[PDB]
Design a protein around this nucleic acid. Structure first.
Ligand SMILES: [Mg+2]
Ligand SMILES: [Mg+2]
Ligand SMILES: [Mg+2]
Ligand SMILES: [Mg+2]
Ligand SMILES: [Mg+2]
Ligand SMILES: [Mg+2]
Ligand SMILES: [Mg+2]
Ligand SMILES: [Mg+2]
Ligand SMILES: [Mg+2]
Ligand SMILES: [Mg+2]
Ligand SMILES: [Mg+2]
Ligand SMILES: [Mg+2]
Ligand SMILES: [Mg+2]
Ligand SMILES: [Mg+2]
Ligand SMILES: [Mg+2]
Ligand SMILES: [Mg+2]
Ligand SMILES: [Mg+2]
Ligand SMILES: [Mg+2]
Ligand SMILES: [Mg+2]
Ligand SMILES: [Mg+2]
Ligand SMILES: [Mg+2]
Ligand SMILES: [Mg+2]
Ligand SMILES: [Mg+2]
Ligand SMILES: [Mg+2]
Ligand SMILES: [Mg+2]
Ligand SMILES: [Mg+2]
Ligand SMILES: [Mg+2]
Ligand SMILES: [Mg+2]
Ligand SMILES: [Mg+2]
Ligand SMILES: [Mg+2]
Ligand SMILES: [Mg+2]
Ligand SMILES: [Mg+2]
Ligand SMILES: [Mg+2]
Ligand SMILES: [Mg+2]
Ligand SMILES: [Mg+2]
Lengths: 394, 63, 131
RNA sequence: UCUGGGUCGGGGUUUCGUACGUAGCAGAGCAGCUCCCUCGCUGCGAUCUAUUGAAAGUCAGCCCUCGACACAAGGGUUUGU
RNA sequence: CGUUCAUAGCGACGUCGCUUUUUGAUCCUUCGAUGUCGGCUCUUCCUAUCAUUGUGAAGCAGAAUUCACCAAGCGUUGGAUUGUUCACCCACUAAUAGGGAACGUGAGCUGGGUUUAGACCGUCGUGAGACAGGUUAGUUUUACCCUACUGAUGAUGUGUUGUUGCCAUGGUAAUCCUGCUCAGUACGAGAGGAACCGCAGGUUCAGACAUUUGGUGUAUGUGCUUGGCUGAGGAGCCAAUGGGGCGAAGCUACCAUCUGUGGGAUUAUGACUGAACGCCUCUAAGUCAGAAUCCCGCCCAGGCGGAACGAUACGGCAGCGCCGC
RNA sequence: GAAUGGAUGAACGAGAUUCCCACUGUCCCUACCUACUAUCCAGCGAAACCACAGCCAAGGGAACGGGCUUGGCGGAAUCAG
RNA sequence: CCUCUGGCAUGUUGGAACAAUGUAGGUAAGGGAAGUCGGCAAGCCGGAUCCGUAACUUCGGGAUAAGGAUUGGCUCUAAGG
RNA sequence: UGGCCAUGGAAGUCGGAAUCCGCUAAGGAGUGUGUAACAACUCACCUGCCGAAUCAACUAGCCCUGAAAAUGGAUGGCGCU
RNA sequence: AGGGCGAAGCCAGAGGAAACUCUGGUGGAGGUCCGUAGCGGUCCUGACGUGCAAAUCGGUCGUCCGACCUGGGUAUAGGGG
């Protein structure tokens, strides 16, 4: 018989094999369509989820009840120290797909990057790209290099730069810097390639990719939760108290007579550590890192035009389970995928953004900087020292 | 962003945090956190409780 | 013009919020919440500012033994305002009302939540304190 | 050997709510002794004040130390166009 | 019949069918047993479409509407009584459409009801006993096998190894509503009373997340306190977590917060040019618009499928890469 | 329907119902914690069951096939469920 | 419930983890039986002293009816041989 | 020619018995629209243009409508014009 | 075990003209109530369900001076007890 009282089914099939993702670094499954017209640029970046916090802002959507009313708002800090371009890699269209065609690597490559290429660095002699870099200083090699670049000019269509992180500049344990292919979207391929050939071995900061009040897509791996039962992993009803063989289950897997259990039926398995591409996360603040002209410039982070203090986005006692954000960072609206410390791919949108909400200009009023390691009540240490007065530790 | 003061302890309450109580007499209280609010609801006279501002004013601490 | 925003709604069907207008009713047994499509097994729930059908369980015998519309005015479940302040109210409470939003009483004892005030003007007019 | 990661220590953060001891003309009263002084002295006495936002915990999956201590090319199995 | 008018909507007397969500026939299968109703829970299909999209109809002025077409994408709820299926009532709603899967689903539950044994009542029986007549009390076993599904190591290949990648094939997702505006406007004698574009939000669903609010809390963190026990103080312990305040981190909640997209072919339909048929016709050759559809996109997984690039065993015995013969 | 006992009835009942107050995770709607498991390891080590076996759709067929026909297809060995 | 006398080695094993399902305990915001055949299960209540105690009744009961208040520590007083 | 029956109005026109003559080139005592009823409109006979076949009623072949089911599916399959 | 209720009888005081009645005690009745050991075995339709167990375990329960529980001895034997 039919099921009596209808109800929409639990969980989406558009997300499954609900298995542990192969990758850790979230792949960009599609870069935006390079119109050939606008100038060249990078489409993606690779940051790190340092931590959350508040903002306060005046909102300007006329019509709303909240028009010209200061709301608060959660935000993620994605610490994003500049990447280093160490390669380009040409692709060519085929009817089979999109074959990689030619990879030209830079001359010098950091041990940050070289780390990646060995499973055990302690034990290696660190001999990678050793016979490669010989090419970059002779007649023969330099000529072959030029012919490779020329061939890419003749044949290739898509060009991706290879860059990698500056694992050096982070509070993370790891030294093995994440590489990633990032796509150069812009003018003609010959122009496109000579841009990336100029950028080779060079820094690239965040502000060169992204701008403020820009919708971007966060790509990463979800905070993993191990083996989980069907009630956790699918949010199935619990069965009642009296159930004899347990109650965090599904009762009827399936009907008798497709005499197999279907792929659509809810089973217990891996919950979390899935790959996920959340879209439309507006950049409220691209924040300038600590720098030196005479003394430190720690202010330039979490100070606003209306606050004017001497904060950084770092709260008291740091971001928890992370560190100090001593580098440039972006500040997205809302939560994003994954854990603290997780490497996170940003990506420019796939989508022509023209909604009132997606063109809204964000002027921040106040960044909360109170500790997250307990219930914080002081924004800065100087404020605390004022409020408390002197302590026995003096 | 009018920073308010905790009706128990005395600390300031920054926009994000804490909770707002609206008693039927028709007067309102702000609590920094639950710790304050619990002492308030259990009727603890904050001048008796050391860590509050009201106590330390009463006992002339600092200065 | 400007619409409501959702708020943590802590009156499922089965609550007896106290009538806070001068009718003569004391309680308001919420038998249903107006404008709820709802899902299997799920109780219809009315926060503050929500319309509601309401049997009176104790009070005058004119009102008893029939259904009236009503509005929830305070509620003990702490909702979050858009300015990031949570707020709760000490008591759940409402007012008997007609289809078109007018009160059938005349004066509201206690404070009304401004989520309810802005959305219900005739309630707001008879409300002494707001928020 | 971007000298490193680790243990201990030190800060920071934070949780709780002000330790022991000592002192007090604080302390409902009571007692012993007498100089029967009843503010006599001396003792008992919940609690109170002060020292004292003190004490104590705070990565084990918080943050910074570059202070102290050692320890850091070591072992085993592999695989060939 | 529908004032008038067979056919807007209907439809007698007659007639032709489909259907197996009714009940009968029948007894082919199973009596060395296929667990016998209902409810819960969960998935999937069908359409004979209640709503939602696109449309033709009216006895369609508007509003409300019934009739029909494409169409099953997405929905179709909360309760009172009843073991119920069914039924009815209240309430909300956009709508509270209908079914199938061994009358889906007992090694999934439950066991209220049927349907052992204990008992009561009525009617029947001389009686033992009987009763699709009522009542109450009454054991719900087993998975470690194979498959299927869920996730988890691996597998053959590529000389070995690592890299960054492509993408065959699978899956797939968004939903509907309110308010404001249009506007007391069109339409209408009035009564009443729309719609497209905007704008603001919300339902249900999905995917995350923990700044904040809440929950947990054996950091057994820090007080407080019972009975006992270290002669007492101090410091502690025991009482299967002695109890209780408050509680970091961490999990976690429409109980907190964030995000949810674009094309193509066309269907129904309405059209163009235009014969057949010196006219006329959307059609016959030819052309246009066209959708909750379908296919892709995005999104998830990634093939006994490929890719470019790196390094390729100094040695103490080594072993190999090219080249030519 | 009247000792096949009728009508009653305080007290009593691990007896059968119905409502109200209180109270609650019964539920809305699930969540976190603890202990013993399950898990991996050393040692030890059973049983039921077993024609052969074990991927599907449809067909026909003793009228619901793992095996047959026609199609889809098929990749070692395993782990927790 | 904790202790001495006396008695034991945790009931036929150990180690490492802390997943899903369980078994046995706990706690939960707002609501409070909307759950379910049915408040099943758990929760409320609980000791004592002082008040206060209904209908009904076989006058014995009902009755701890219901419904209220108090409770610690300390320092004293008075009353009982 | 308000023809007759029917008055409730049918002078062609809800219906029904009738149902012919004149002018005629020729128009039914009327196919409908519609009217309280008319009116008004609409539906032969003949021309003007154009330039050979035209049109009706049956009948039977293929094709199509009629033609709705639940795991995804079967002229045996692939396919075939 | 320990508690509760407090029947007859008895004392005093007060009233009553008498009959006798009230008030305070004492007294300790009962197939009386709570509740241990004991005896039992309601519910969870809990655990277990190739068990610890061919009927056990946990909480929750009934009863707990009486038709009470219980050892040994002794009697009744199969259409018989
Ligand atoms: Mg259905
Ligand atoms: Mg059971
Ligand atoms: Mg925090
Ligand atoms: Mg339900
Ligand atoms: Mg007729
Ligand atoms: Mg049959
Ligand atoms: Mg079976
Ligand atoms: Mg149809
Ligand atoms: Mg069945
Ligand atoms: Mg089954
Ligand atoms: Mg069973
Ligand atoms: Mg039964
Ligand atoms: Mg029976
Ligand atoms: Mg096992
Ligand atoms: Mg002590
Ligand atoms: Mg014990
Ligand atoms: Mg057409
Ligand atoms: Mg077209
Ligand atoms: Mg189109
Ligand atoms: Mg696809
Ligand atoms: Mg009789
Ligand atoms: Mg008689
Ligand atoms: Mg009888
Ligand atoms: Mg078989
Ligand atoms: Mg033990
Ligand atoms: Mg042992
Ligand atoms: Mg033993
Ligand atoms: Mg609760
Ligand atoms: Mg129900
Ligand atoms: Mg119910
Ligand atoms: Mg119970
Ligand atoms: Mg009673
Ligand atoms: Mg059982
Ligand atoms: Mg078992
Ligand atoms: Mg044992």
């Amino acid at each position: 018989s039919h099921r009596k009282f209808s109800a929409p089914r639990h969980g989406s099939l558009g997300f499954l094999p609900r298995k542990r993702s192969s990758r850790h670094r979230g792949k960009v499954k599609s870069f935006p369509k390079d119109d050939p017209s606008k100038p060249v640029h990078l489409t993606a970046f690779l940051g790190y989820k340092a931590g959350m916090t508040h903002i306060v802002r005046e909102v300007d959507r006329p019509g709303s009840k909240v028009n010209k009313k200061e709301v608060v708002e959660a935000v993620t800090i994605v610490e994003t120290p500049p990447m280093v371009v160490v390669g380009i890699v040409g692709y060519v269209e085929t009817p089979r797909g999109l074959r990689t065609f030619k990879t030209v690597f830079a001359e010098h490559i950091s041990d940050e990057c070289k780390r990646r290429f060995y499973k055990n660095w302690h034990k290696s002699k660190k001999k990678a790209f050793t016979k490669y870099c010989k090419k970059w200083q002779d007649d023969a090699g330099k000529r072959q290099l030029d012919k490779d670049f020329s061939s890419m000019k003749k044949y290739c269509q898509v060009i991706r730069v290879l860059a990698h992180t500056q694992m050096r500049l982070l509070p993370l344990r790891q030294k093995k810097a994440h590489l990633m292919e990032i796509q150069v979207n812009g003018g003609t391929v010959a122009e496109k390639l000579d841009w990336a050939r100029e950028r080779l071995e060079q820094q690239v900061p965040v502000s060169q990719v992204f701008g403020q009040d820009e919708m971007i897509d966060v790509i990463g791996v979800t905070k993993g939760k191990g083996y989980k039962g069907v009630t956790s992993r699918w949010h199935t009803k619990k069965l009642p108290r009296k159930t004899h063989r347990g109650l965090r289950k599904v009762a009827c897997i399936g009907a008798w007579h497709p005499a197999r259990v279907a792929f659509s039926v809810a089973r217990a398995g891996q919950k979390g550590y899935h790959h996920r591409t959340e879209i439309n996360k507006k950049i409220y603040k691209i924040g300038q890192g600590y720098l030196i002209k005479d003394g430190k410039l720690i202010k330039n982070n979490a100070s606003t035009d209306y606050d004017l203090s001497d904060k950084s986005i770092n709260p008291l006692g740091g971001f928890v389970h992370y560190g100090e954000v001593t580098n440039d960072f972006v500040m997205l609206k809302g939560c994003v995928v994954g854990t603290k410390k997780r490497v996170l791919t940003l990506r420019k949108s796939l989508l022509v953004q023209t909604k009132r909400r997606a063109l809204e200009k964000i002027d921040l009023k106040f960044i909360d900087t109170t500790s997250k390691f307990g219930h914080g009540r002081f924004q800065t240490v100087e404020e605390k020292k004022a409020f408390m007065g002197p302590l026995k530790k003096d | 962003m009018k920073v308010e003061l905790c009706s128990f302890s005395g600390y300031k309450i920054y926009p994000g945090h804490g909770r707002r109580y609206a008693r039927t007499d028709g007067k309102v209280f702000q609590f920094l956190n639950a710790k304050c609010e619990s002492a308030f609801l259990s009727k603890r006279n904050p001048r008796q409780i050391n860590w509050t501002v009201l106590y330390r004013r009463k006992h002339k601490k600092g200065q | 013009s400007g619409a409501k925003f959702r708020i943590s709604l802590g009156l499922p069907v089965g609550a007896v919020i106290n009538c806070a207008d001068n009718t003569g009713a004391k309680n308001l047994y919420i038998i249903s919440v107006k404008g709820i499509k709802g899902r299997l097994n799920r109780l219809p729930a009315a926060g503050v500012g929500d319309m509601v059908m309401a049997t009176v369980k104790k009070g005058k015998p004119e009102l008893r033994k029939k259904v009236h519309p009503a509005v929830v005015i305070r509620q003990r479940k702490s909702y979050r305002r858009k300015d990031g302040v949570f707020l709760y109210f000490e008591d759940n409470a409402g007012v008997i009302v007609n289809n078109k939003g007018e009160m059938k009483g005349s004066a509201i004892t206690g404070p009304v939540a401004k989520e309810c005030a802005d959305l219900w003007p005739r309630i707001a007019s008879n409300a002494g304190s707001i928020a």
